[PDB]
Amino acid sequence: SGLNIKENDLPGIGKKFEIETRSHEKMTIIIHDDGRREIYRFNDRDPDELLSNISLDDSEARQIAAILGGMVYKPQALESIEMAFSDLIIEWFKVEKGAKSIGRTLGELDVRQNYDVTVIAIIKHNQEKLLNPGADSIIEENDTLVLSGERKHLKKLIHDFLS
Strand-pairing partners, residue 55, are: 38
> What is the pattern of x (binds a copy of itself, CB under 8 A) and - over residues 105-134?
-------xx--xxxxxx-x-----x-xxxx
- Which residues, 6+ apart, have CB-to-CB distance to 11 below 8 Å? none
User: What's the rounded Cα separation, in Å, for the pair 122 and 130?
Assistant: 5
Among residue numbers 35 through 74, which ones bind a copy of itself (CB under 8 A)?
35-37, 39, 41, 51-52, 54-73
Q: Which is nearer to a copy of itself, 41 or 155 (CB)?
A: 41
Q: Report the 10 Å Cβ neighbour count for 107.
A: 12
Q: Give the one residue of 5, 54, 71, 135 binding ligand 2BA; rule: CB under 6 A.
A: 135
In this structure, the dihedral spanned by the alpha carbons of residues 7, 10, 11 and 15, taken in order and rounded to 10 degrees, is -60
User: What's the rounded Cα separation, in Å, for the pair 66 and 57?
Assistant: 14
Taking CB within 5 to 8 Å according to partner kind, which of a copy of itself, ligand 2BA, none is near residue 3?
a copy of itself
> Is residue 97 involved in binding a copy of itself (CB under 8 A)?
no
Taking CB within 5 to 8 Å according to partner kind, which of ligand 2BA, a copy of itself, none is near residue 19?
a copy of itself
> Is residue 27 involved in binding a copy of itself (CB under 8 A)?
yes
Among residue numbers 92 through 111, which ones bind ligand 2BA (CB under 6 A)?
106-107, 110-111
The arrangement of strands across the sheet holding 50-56 comes to 4-10, 14-20, 26-32, 37-42, 50-56
Taking CB within 5 to 8 Å according to partner kind, which of ligand 2BA, a copy of itself, none is near residue 62?
a copy of itself
Strand-pairing partners, residue 7, are: 17
Task: Give contact residues for ligand 2BA (rule: CB under 6 A).
Answer: 106-107, 110-113, 118-119, 133-135
